[PDB]
């Protein structure tokens, strides 16, 4: 009964999706993947399948449900799969190495797939040296301090000195800037930086917060920089926090910002705000080289409250939608342009409020 034959082959491959090990995209972790690399033997989301197609000499994809399958292809998935791929392709992933989520930028999702399956960095660990050696140097494009032009500059990350440094566009032996690892936070910001490989590096200098904005033409190179920076952070935290587990530390290597955007602050004046964990920073503009100031936001239990609207007898022209933050010592007033802005900011603030000290 050929109908039964066809049906059985179809339900065989579907049943593989219905294995717990295959319940999430192999690459980004999105639930319920619908596609497959029948050459890598993994189940993946639509988005990751699109990336896989761009490495055709490595990965060939089909829809699990909507494409025709050969017995041997189904058999290959059955002998392989996502657990198998974890053991094979993620065998030697360093603890510091950033693993992308579905909301990450394309660069990170793409480079993850390439690192695992193309370059096979976690099968052959000598390939990990760019981000594992505690020393890395190379050229990067850096946004001008006070202008929008990028200049190519030599950067050096040196664990021995606990710093990232760059140099002038000259022969000089002494760096232009030294950025200490202890308070360095690197996040990818392609939208903001206006380059798909745009990396923001934010650090503490002379008890003030500073930003640089850099990129490399090559996706691999920038992502190597990023992971090198994480390595340095990790090795730092390990020293700083004896007895802390890997899991304790890894979430601290770098931190995406809870929320960023324009708000008005007390007259009222528009500033670009950035919520970094418990630290609400502001700037004149997103590409400002320095923080103009900062507000700390502790726990509800520590006397912090987030309230909607403005207090009675608030005066001025402002944006319509107010937020008040009550601290044990002070009051902070903000005005948001829109309600969704307000809702968004309220929630970010509340995240800090709701989290114990
Ligand atoms: Zn995916």
UniProtKB/Swiss-Prot annotation:
GTPase-activating protein for the ADP ribosylation factor family. Binds phosphatidylinositol 3,4,5-trisphosphate (PtdInsP3) and inositol 1,3,4,5-tetrakisphosphate (InsP4). Regulates the incorporation of CD63 and CD9 into multivesicular bodies. Expressed at highest levels in brain and at lower levels in peripheral blood leukocytes. Keywords: Acetylation, Cytoplasm, GTPase activation, Metal-binding, Nucleus, Phosphoprotein, Repeat, Zinc, Zinc-finger. The modification N6-acetyllysine is found at residue 270. This is Arf-GAP with dual PH domain-containing protein 1. Residues 11-130 form the Arf-GAP domain. PROSITE patterns: ARFGAP, PH_DOMAIN. It is found in: Nucleus; Cytoplasm. Phosphorylated by PRKCA, PRKCI, PRKCZ and PRKD1 in vitro. One of its GO terms (biological process) is cell surface receptor signaling pathway. It holds the Pfam family ArfGap. The keyword Acetylation applies. One of its GO terms (cellular component) is nucleus. The modification Phosphothreonine is found at residue 274. Interacts with PRKCA, PRKCI and PRKCZ. Interacts with the N-terminal region of PRKD1. Residues 133-234, 256-354 form the PH domain. InterPro entries: Arf-GAP_dual-PH_domain (IPR052589), ARFGAP/RecO (IPR037278), ArfGAP_dom (IPR001164), ArfGAP_dom_sf (IPR038508), PH-like_dom_sf (IPR011993), PH1_ADAP (IPR037849), PH2_ADAP (IPR037851), PH_domain (IPR001849). A zinc finger (C4-type) spans 25-48. SUPFAM superfamilies: ArfGap/RecO-like zinc finger (SSF57863), PH domain-like (SSF50729). CDD domains: ArfGap_ADAP1, PH1_ADAP, PH2_ADAP. The modification Phosphoserine is found at residue 91. GO terms for molecular function: GTPase activator activity; inositol 1,3,4,5 tetrakisphosphate binding; phosphatidylinositol bisphosphate binding; phosphatidylinositol-3,4,5-trisphosphate binding; zinc ion binding. Changing residue 25 to A: Loss of GTPase-activating activity.
